[PDB]
Amino acid sequence: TTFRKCYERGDFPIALEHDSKGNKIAWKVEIEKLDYHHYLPLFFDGLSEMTFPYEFFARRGIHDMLEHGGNKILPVIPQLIIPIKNALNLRNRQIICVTLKVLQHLVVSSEMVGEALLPYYRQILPILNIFKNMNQQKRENIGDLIQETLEAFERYGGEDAFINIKYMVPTYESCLLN
Amino acid sequence: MFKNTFQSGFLSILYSIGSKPLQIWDKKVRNGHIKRITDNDIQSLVLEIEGTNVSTTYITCPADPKKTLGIKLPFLVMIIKNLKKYFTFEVQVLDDKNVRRRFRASNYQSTTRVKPFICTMPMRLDDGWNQIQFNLSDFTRRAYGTNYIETLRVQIHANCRIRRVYFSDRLYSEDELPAEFKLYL
Amino acid sequence: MRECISIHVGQAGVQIGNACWELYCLEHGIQPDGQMPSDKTIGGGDDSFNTFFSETGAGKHVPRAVFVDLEPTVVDEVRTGTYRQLFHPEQLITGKEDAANNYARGHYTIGKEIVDLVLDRIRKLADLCTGLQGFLIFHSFGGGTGSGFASLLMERLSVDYGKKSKLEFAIYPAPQVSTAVVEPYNSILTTHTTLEHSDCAFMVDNEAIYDICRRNLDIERPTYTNLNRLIGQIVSSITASLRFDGALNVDLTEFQTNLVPYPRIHFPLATYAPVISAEKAYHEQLSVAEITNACFEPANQMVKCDPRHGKYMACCMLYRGDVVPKDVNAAIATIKTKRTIQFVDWCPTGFKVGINYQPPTVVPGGDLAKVQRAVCMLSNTTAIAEAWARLDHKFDLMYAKRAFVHWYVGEGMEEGEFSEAREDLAALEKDYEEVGVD
Amino acid sequence: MRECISIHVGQAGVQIGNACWELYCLEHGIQPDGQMPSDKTIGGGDDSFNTFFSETGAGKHVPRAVFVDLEPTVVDEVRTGTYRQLFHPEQLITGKEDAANNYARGHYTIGKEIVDLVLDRIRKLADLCTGLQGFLIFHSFGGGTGSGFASLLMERLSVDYGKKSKLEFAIYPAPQVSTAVVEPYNSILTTHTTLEHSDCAFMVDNEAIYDICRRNLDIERPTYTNLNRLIGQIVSSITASLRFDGALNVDLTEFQTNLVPYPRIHFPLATYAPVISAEKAYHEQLSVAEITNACFEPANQMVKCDPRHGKYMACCMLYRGDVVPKDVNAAIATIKTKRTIQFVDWCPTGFKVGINYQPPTVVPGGDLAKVQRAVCMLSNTTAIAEAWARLDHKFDLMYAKRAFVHWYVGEGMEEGEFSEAREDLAALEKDYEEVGVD
Amino acid sequence: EPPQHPRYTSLFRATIKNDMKKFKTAMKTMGP
Amino acid sequence: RQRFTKNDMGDHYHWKDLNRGINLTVYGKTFRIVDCDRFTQDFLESQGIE
Amino acid sequence: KIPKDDLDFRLATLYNHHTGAFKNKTEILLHQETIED
Numbered sequence A: 001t002t003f004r005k006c007y008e009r010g011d012f013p014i015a016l017e018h019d020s021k022g023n024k025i026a027w028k029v030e031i032e033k034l035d036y037h038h039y040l041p042l043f044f045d046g047l048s049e050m051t052f053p054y055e056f057f058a059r060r061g062i063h064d065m066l067e068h069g070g071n072k073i074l075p076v077i078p079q080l081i082i083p084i085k086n087a088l089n090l091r092n093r094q095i096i097c098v099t100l101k102v103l104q105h106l107v108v109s110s111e112m113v114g115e116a117l118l119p120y121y122r123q124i125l126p127i128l129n130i131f132k133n134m135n136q137q138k139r140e141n142i143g144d145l146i147q148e149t150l151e152a153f154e155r156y157g158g159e160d161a162f163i164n165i166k167y168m169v170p171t172y173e174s175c176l177l178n
Numbered sequence B: 001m002f003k004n005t006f007q008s009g010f011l012s013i014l015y016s017i018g019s020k021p022l023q024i025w026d027k028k029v030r031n032g033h034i035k036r037i038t039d040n041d042i043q044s045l046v047l048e049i050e051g052t053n054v055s056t057t058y059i060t061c062p063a064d065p066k067k068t069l070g071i072k073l074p075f076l077v078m079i080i081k082n083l084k085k086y087f088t089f090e091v092q093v094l095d096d097k098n099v100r101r102r103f104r105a106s107n108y109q110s111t112t113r114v115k116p117f118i119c120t121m122p123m124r125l126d127d128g129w130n131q132i133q134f135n136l137s138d139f140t141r142r143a144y145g146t147n148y149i150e151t152l153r154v155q156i157h158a159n160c161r162i163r164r165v166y167f168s169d170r171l172y173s174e175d176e177l178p179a180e181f182k183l184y185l
Numbered sequence C, D: 001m002r003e004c005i006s007i008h009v010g011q012a013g014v015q016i017g018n019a020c021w022e023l024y025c026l027e028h029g030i031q032p033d034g035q036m037p038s039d040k041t042i043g044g045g046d047d048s049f050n051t052f053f054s055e056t057g058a059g060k061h062v063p064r065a066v067f068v069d070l071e072p073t074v075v076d077e078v079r080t081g082t083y084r085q086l087f088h089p090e091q092l093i094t095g096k097e098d099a100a101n102n103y104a105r106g107h108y109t110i111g112k113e114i115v116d117l118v119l120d121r122i123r124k125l126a127d128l129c130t131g132l133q134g135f136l137i138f139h140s141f142g143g144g145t146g147s148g149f150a151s152l153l154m155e156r157l158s159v160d161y162g163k164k165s166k167l168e169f170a171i172y173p174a175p176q177v178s179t180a181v182v183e184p185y186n187s188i189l190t191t192h193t194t195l196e197h198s199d200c201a202f203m204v205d206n207e208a209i210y211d212i213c214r215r216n217l218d219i220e221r222p223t224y225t226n227l228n229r230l231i232g233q234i235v236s237s238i239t240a241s242l243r244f245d246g247a248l249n250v251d252l253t254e255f256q257t258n259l260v261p262y263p264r265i266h267f268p269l270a271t272y273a274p275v276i277s278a279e280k281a282y283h284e285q286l287s288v289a290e291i292t293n294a295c296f297e298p299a300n301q302m303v304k305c306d307p308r309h310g311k312y313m314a315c316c317m318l319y320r321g322d323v324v325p326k327d328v329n330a331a332i333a334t335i336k337t338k339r340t341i342q343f344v345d346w347c348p349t350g351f352k353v354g355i356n357y358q359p360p361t362v363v364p365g366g367d368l369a370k371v372q373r374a375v376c377m378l379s380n381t382t383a384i385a386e387a388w389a390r391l392d393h394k395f396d397l398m399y400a401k402r403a404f405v406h407w408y409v410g411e412g413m414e415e416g417e418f419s420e421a422r423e424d425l426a427a428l429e430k431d432y433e434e435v436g437v438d
Numbered sequence E: 001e002p003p004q005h006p007r008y009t010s011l012f013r014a015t016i017k018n019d020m021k022k023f024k025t026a027m028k029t030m031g032p
Numbered sequence F: 001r002q003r004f005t006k007n008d009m010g011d012h013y014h015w016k017d018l019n020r021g022i023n024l025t026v027y028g029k030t031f032r033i034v035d036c037d038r039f040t041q042d043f044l045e046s047q048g049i050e
Numbered sequence G: 001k002i003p004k005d006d007l008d009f010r011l012a013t014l015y016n017h018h019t020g021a022f023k024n025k026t027e028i029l030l031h032q033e034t035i036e037d
């Protein structure tokens, strides 16, 4: 893939910490005054990537700028769209679990997200619609994460959000008035 | 070629005092010459490339066409002495789309031409020892609206008086430059 | 409607156009007098003819063409020939001089005071046309006089009308045969002036058709009469899709779009399979399989190229004659099965079939055959760059000794045009090999 | 459907083919125009004639034969004859030099630049044909220009087509008539070059044909007109099974299988039974028993080998006309009960019988009779070795004094190949000696 | 070494070799 | 361009039957012949149609 | 091997049609070591 070679070449000053069996990280140059447009989706390609030690960077940094960078995602969303569905087609259980987690954090991160995402469901949803039900130690139940995603989504999405999600998902239920 | 090396710092590709500096520079000699001769102002050996026709005789990088350049830095500086003649040079790069593209700086050029695979630029300048400066991302952004990513080859033509070509990430000032970079007459 | 304009320049360029307009009066039976037999076709002028000839209520077809030249010899001989009553009187524009093979002489010195009149005539043709898809240009690379004038005309036509395609036919310089050593110069000038505004250029060479005439037509001493006849058949076969119809119909806009891939490279090569004597076709057989194999047969192509060396990128075929679709697609499937022909890995479909049923026409006193099936094949490939290699490694040396440049510089050009051209040529060959690279 | 190709080489190998087609036109009612009467008969070449003629929608029945020669004389004369309008023009292939009876000259010096064209013709028939059951090659062992050229083209076709039959028919070296002294050389060379690829080869002797013509045809001053007429009726008899039908039919595959026991020896003899003068047939009778007696009569065979010198392995009987299974089987039963003829003990049954209804045909201006019951006979036997023995010692004596080897080495060859050919023919012989020995 | 195969004396050497000479009287008949 | 059907079976208007002063129905709409031109009557009388 | 005229003319000519000119038919169709060279 392209992001792995991009960093193997090197343009991201990110530091780290580490110990016996667990997790932690650092960085070298701050993100807010570097960029959220020229580097956000390129780094997101690491999500579709699955290889040590690159996935560490992906899984964490994706959260990191989410906490640290709220009022900038506004225009970058169509660029964000692509690696999402690429990883979804990649069809790996662990990868899609990591996705589900980070996408959960994405939607809850800030405002305006669902309303701007209005044009952008018919590509992300239906593959999940079919992922619904193939199947708490470390949050491993695919189906539970799926219903959590739909739950956190629809109420914040808006008004016809649920009806279009329903049109995707014939099981789908209301979390609003039932 | 040497991708494993560090784009950090400065990249002198050719520098005159090198004993045998022509490895990765394929030469195409025709009705011309390559010569290695001192100057009067720097009174130091420099390269001289001349020929009857400039398209016939030209130096290029890399030597193996089956190899790329592999450079990230978007800033280029050449140390040239104008010789009151007809010189040009060429660079080819790979972009955000992964389609190849060329830039053609020609001293004669009477106009500016944009072709889907290559851009052209006239060169006019003073005499004596002067300098070249260019920004790959700048020009690609302005012309093709794409985003510079890496370099793949570079070619230089005749009618030129040569000290050093080098690359840098940014527009560097005049004081961080080493003494050999700090040209004096 | 589906009507256009024919433009002819250069005393070598005019005999071929003359033959073409003959073959265009043939099929609709336009008498050399100007009016039909007692049988009726005249009126407001709305049928297969209203595209080539304007026969308004006057009863005389007016060909929608203009012939221009600088040397009055050929234009006056055609003024005094057979079809002068048919040719519009001042549609035959004459100069009083020659360009002495100097491109810039033909461009600057004299062209300034004639472009006004020629553009006036073409605009007054524009008023009478309705759709006017465009123009058929007849000229030559090594234009002994017409090259520069034609380049200038094409540029100014481009700057005023940018909303219609241009299909052009220039006779390629003979690779190893030189009629004069000024041809590389004026050729390269024409190339750099035309490649960037020309739409679809087809090259043709005279040596190859000569060798064909001796090869299978079996005539050891061919002529311009014969060669012009054959190329007139070529252009008539292409314009048949315009005039008549069949199963489906195709058009020049499709030709350019489907054939030229990118900007720049729009230079396909021509072939016409069933060239044979009347006595041979009299008791030998013709059908789709063998005629297609012929159109791929290396001797049948009119450019000094090795399709083995090259690789194929696009192809169109126009089938004029009583045929059926299945065996066509079956034969083309067999070609797809074949191995040695090397298509590139970009277009798994690379063919533009066109069907028309009206038989290709014969000429009185001719050396063609009573055709029932014919296919004219156009193809764009990667093997032509070597001819440019030939012409540049011929150019370079004489440029290096700067021979004859005094003529051009004294008349008022500089070296920069030549400079420009040499790297343009290098650029062309390099992009050719690059797109050849997968 | 059912069909075969014909190839003719050697300056004297061509008038016989001329005669064969001058025959076929009659019984298919073909006129030297190439056209039938107005009765609805034309197609792509699909009717009774389709087995050897492609009569495309142009209504002309094209013979499926290619006539090649190294010298222009006979070929251009026949091109000036009364069938050039019929024949495919370049299917008559010309050279511009003789061979002077040297095998290696033609096989090496000139053959390499005509074989290409002839192979092109071979394939450009093999494309339109469908079944392609085999070939008929006409040549001459003591070739004036036949030996080397036929050998090399046979080798090329043997290595290009492993899935079809081949037929090799010719005049044999005369036992005691020496029309050209290098005959032993060229003969033995061709024998070795063919033994390892040949399928079925028939050998005839013009002296014996002459003798028959003198004996019972009531003719004493004959010509090739007569002799080639005879070989033509032979070819007609063998191809009748394909031309028409019958109670039972057989195929070239049937002869191939049922006639040759092993590899190697696959060279039979043939005989046409009812050869008779017109008045003789007028005032006697013919029928199955007597005609079979005549056919197995030793002297009416066309090879100077006495059957009582040896013994028979196998026999094929092809009956043209109107006969019945009853009398044919009764007659052959009497034949077997007869004590003179001796069949080898391996196969007490050794008979392959076949029938066709159509009577044999009389040619205008001919010399045959009005026959209604023809029978051709093919025999595979052991008496054949006598000719081989007769030739080998002429070979070895001229080898002993080593004359004209200067010719051969000068044109660039060495003696080890003739050395080979000696023991090669000896090995074929020892094969014959074992198979004869019980 | 492939031994030389005996030229088969199926008469011939005996018969035909003698006959070809016995049925000749040439070198005589145009006079001495 | 096509051929034309006289009667039901699939017949075809062979010129052997056409003359002046004839009417004919063709896919519904029926027509009448008035007169012809030079080569037409010359050829047709060369055949001999009265 | 060869199916027809196509593979014949395309495989075995050696007549580099750009290189040669003023030649004749037989010269146009010429094989390689396939024949003997």
Ligand SMILES: Nc1nc2c(ncn2[C@@H]2O[C@H](COP(=O)(O)OP(=O)(O)OP(=O)(O)O)[C@@H](O)[C@H]2O)c(=O)[nH]1
Pocket (backbone or CB within 6 Å): C009, C010, C011, C012, C013, C014, C015, C016, C071, C098, C101, C139, C140, C142, C143, C144, C145, C146, C147, C171, C179, C224, C228
């Ligand atoms: N179009 C065409 N070209 C021909 C014919 N016969 C020869 N030629 C070639 O066409 C070229 C003619 O170009 P030029 O001689 O420059 O023609 P021009 O520029 O109109 O002016 P002139 O030099 O006076 O003829 C020659 O190089 C010939 O090789 C022909 O019948 N038609």
Ligand SMILES: Nc1nc2c(ncn2[C@@H]2O[C@H](COP(=O)(O)OP(=O)(O)OP(=O)(O)O)[C@@H](O)[C@H]2O)c(=O)[nH]1
Pocket (backbone or CB within 6 Å): D009, D010, D011, D012, D013, D014, D015, D016, D071, D098, D099, D100, D101, D139, D140, D142, D143, D144, D145, D146, D147, D171, D179, D180, D224
């Ligand atoms: N097939 C055939 N053979 C004949 C005829 N007349 C004589 N012959 C014998 O058949 C042989 C034919 O071979 P060649 O004489 O070498 O003929 P060629 O090889 O085609 O060419 P040339 O060198 O011109 O003779 C002769 O040597 C004769 O002995 C004939 O009409 N037809």
